[PDB]
Amino acid sequence: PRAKTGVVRRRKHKKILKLAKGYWGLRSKSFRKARETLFAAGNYAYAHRKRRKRDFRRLWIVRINAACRQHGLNYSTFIHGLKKAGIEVDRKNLADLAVREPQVFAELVERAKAAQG
Template identity: 60%
Template sequence: MPRVKRGVTARARHKKILKLAKGYYGARSRVYRVAKQAVIKAGQYAYRDRKQRKRQFRALWIVRINAAARLYGISYSRLINGLTKA
């Protein structure tokens, strides 16, 4: 049975990671080991922040709606309560 040679696969994997790390500072964009860690961490941050972005926008919308509602002498909570009852 011939031995398995993985040079082509390894190079492809390294290229993929380094491509994802393009634009990172210093070794993070040049050294495979460091770049791999940076890419993994970036993915974790991206996943977390996609969830947080939705929360932040909701909070922003609530602040804006509350400000507009108070111009008419009603609070956000009373406005939403009235809308759910309607």
């Protein structure tokens, strides 16, 4: 019962080779360089998936700190009213009222500036 290889490594190289599309040069055509990239593409695909949340937060702090500053208070003054006043509403995902429609976010500034003491 001789079991030669035959089809299974051609299918296995087609899975990695057709999984690795759009790469520079021999790491999209050759099979020994396609799996050396998809390992790093998987590790970068994990770590940058962990980094997307924190990077979007680092965008949200710049949008909130950018929008609140011209009212006469910065970010550290702004959050101190929210954590103490029981008005934890914004929660840094609600920057789209500081961007889209600021006539109510300005009222959130009015609720936050009176909560300094």
